[PDB]
Design a protein around this ligand. Sequence first.
Ligand SMILES: CCCCCCCCCCCCCCCCCC(=O)O[C@@H](COC(=O)CCCCCCCCCCCCCCC)COP(=O)(O)OC[C@H](O)CO
Lengths: 459, 57, 173, 120, 99
Amino acid sequence: MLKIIIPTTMLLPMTWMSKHNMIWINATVHSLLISLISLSLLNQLGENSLNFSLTFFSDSLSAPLLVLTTWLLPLMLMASQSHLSKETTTRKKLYITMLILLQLFLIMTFTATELILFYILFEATLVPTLIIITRWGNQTERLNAGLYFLFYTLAGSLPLLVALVYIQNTTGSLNFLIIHYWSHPLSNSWSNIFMWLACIMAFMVKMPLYGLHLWLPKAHVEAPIAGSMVLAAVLLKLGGYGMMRITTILNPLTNYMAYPFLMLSMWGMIMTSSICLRQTDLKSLIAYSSVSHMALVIVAIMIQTPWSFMGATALMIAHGLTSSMLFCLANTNYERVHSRTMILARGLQTLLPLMATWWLMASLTNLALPPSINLIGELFIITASFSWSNITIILMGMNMMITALYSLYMLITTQRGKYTHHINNIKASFTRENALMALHILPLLLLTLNPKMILGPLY
Amino acid sequence: MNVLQIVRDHWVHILVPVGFVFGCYLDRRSDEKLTAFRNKSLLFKRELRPNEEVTWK
Amino acid sequence: DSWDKDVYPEPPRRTPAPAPQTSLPNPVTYLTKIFDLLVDRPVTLAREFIEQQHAKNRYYYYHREFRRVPDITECEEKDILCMFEAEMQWRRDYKVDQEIVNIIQERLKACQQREGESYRQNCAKELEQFTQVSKAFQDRYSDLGAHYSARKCLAKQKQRMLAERKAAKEAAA
Amino acid sequence: MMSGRPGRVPLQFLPNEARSLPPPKLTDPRLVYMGFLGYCSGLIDNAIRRRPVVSAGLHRQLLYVTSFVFFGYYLLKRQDYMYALRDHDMFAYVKSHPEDFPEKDKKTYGEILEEFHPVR
Amino acid sequence: IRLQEDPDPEDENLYEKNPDSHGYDKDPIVDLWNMRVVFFFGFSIVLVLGSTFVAYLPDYRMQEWARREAERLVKYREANGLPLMESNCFDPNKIQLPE
Ligand SMILES: CCCCCCCCCCCCCCCCCC(=O)O[C@@H](COC(=O)CCCCCCCCCCCCCCC)COP(=O)(O)OC[C@H](O)CO
């Protein structure tokens, strides 16, 4: 509720009014402090969601994502204070302002009690990210990249706007509790499909499914490090949160209309993971891997099965923490080599031995190696999907088989092998990069002991 | 000890902490308007104790 | 004992008396013996020390009880005030029934190792009890959807005697 | 739409009978946000003129907060008036038109036949 | 010369100015202090107590309360001999099924 919001927004005057060089320090202090307070919100009751007021409420689904976003907030500050050191204090302050303003919106939307209120800051997250990708992005095609990312989501979000207000004029309020209790069987009338399509496509776009995913490779690669993590670790997941919330009034229409997306997602994950097997760009390879994992959640959410929701929430968080880490891996390597081609800097393990380890559990976590939370996600989803149909395991398991090859492919090409002779600027890794990397992996294994925290309201 | 300057450069550190203690205040103020069914739901409604007058604040 | 024997029926253990005839010493007696005065007694000595300390300052806690509240079949249409109590009561009974299946599942799994090679026929009672529970559990909550609600559970149920009474009419002929 | 209701004297920002409503409390959360807007203008006001933003012309942005608060306050009373007015003649209408507002029958969920769709 | 620009700056090594550099910022004293913040306010106060806080969090989802009720409920049910959990949930005796 408020105990998270005002501390987040009151953090903004601090960064603006802090000393010239202390900006990174005091921002990091209370961002971690905010994370601690958010963790206090992680508690949930049995069945009734933790409701605070007409404006804000939390459930067993929102809380794990809330603590994840606040937990993220220190990490971009940690990950960004290397390529922004040679910048004017105002621009550094502006950069920090963008992140916490972005993070502030995330707390708002996840705790939003009204769908329209959920909707207003659903796209409002775009404005800070658009600035981050465009201004501080370090590339040339970032301009076209920002346009692709911006227009795709709007093209899907605006139908939701017309759909959402239609609910208000037809079924009174759009309070999440009032929708759930007063749910009615959506008919099969040919208007209700376009009703169904509008209420779904908005979350489809910013949850890249095959076909509606070309923004993500352009979104991730040209975005700066902080932009890439926030976009891949939370931003691809507003779509996820919407579906678990909005599919309450899409049944039984979801039963019949689910087919085109399920085939698109299940086949897409094989295709996308195949792209990972032959990606020339390390950041792009990680980006395409996010599509495969996210497309798995598409099948998870859209099956509408108790087990499927549970594994979704497991992959909901685990992928986000993992994808942020892998982007950190690529970023921590990038500036040393000043290039994105994977084969540019081979045999890094012989030069940097600890990064060899950090890359190693990172690849293992993305492998869904048990008992990592990723395995709990994928394995739960497979069982739910298998109950839905026996055939899907052929597609399901094949993804894990492909996921194995490309995951260690980056490991062998970069970490193992012969070091590149020509390069000589690879310095011993700063303990900031090392500290940040453990900041990611350590909570992941810490979460393994308590899956019930992140299983969700279906748990 | 330089306090005229440690205050100037480290007065920012108190902003968020008071924000949190402020955040609890509206949290513990907004709930008052939400009293309505206080000790009214038959699941939890029960006999009011000799001294305390409000079951849940 | 902490738990209840009625909830967890434990058939009495049949432990044969040790009657060996070979003169050479049986070793496992000795390893149990040395273990007794090397591990078991020191563990017990610490345990009796901690347990007496626990009883020195004993603090209590009880088990929360929710009284019965009108459920969804008598709650008025719309009227989310009565729906709230109805939904929460039904979800609480969902938790109990999930634990009821859990209790039966442990008893079924308890038979396996307990009966050893006799598992196939000895606890067919355990098998049918789980069969009765699982089938009845299916009629209660199965296929309710990830957004299951007491309304849907009533809706799914209302189909059951709808078909049943229709079958009864056909059966009567 | 209230464009021609009986009694609307034109060019009257706050009609007298609106005084029968609870006035907005001096620290109404809507009001302080209106005060926020005044301040936010002040900071940028020094920005265009290239002044030390926050500590630049304490008089200037101080007036901004005062002006926005008052213009906000009278706006809120007027805003509260229409919503009260919109609800008032609303209720007066439905009693005057009982036939167009039938009282829907009281049936519990037990008798309602809501078909069930399995998820399979 | 196309435009009057500047050559691309060379990436400075924080180590060759100060060997103990931690990569958090250039100035050594704040860099050492940034170490203290990122670890003390990172691993120390969040990971350690936060884990204990969430680990020792009170009953979440009523995972044990339902068990105790189930044990009592199942102990009641087989004592009388009626089936230990009915196939029906909302008692059909009240239900007023149409026709
Ligand atoms: C880039 C293109 C879009 C990307 C994909 C987005 C999703 C695809 C479908 C988009 C649908 C947008 C319009 C839906 C608004 C809400 C729909 C709704 O609530 O359902 C209504 C569905 O009714 C409609 O007619 C909705 C619109 C149907 C689709 C036709 C217009 C939308 C498609 C063309 C415009 C957008 C495409 C891009 C054009 C450049 C119910 O009203 P009804 O017809 O049942 O009303 C009662 C009675 O029958 C008479 O009204």
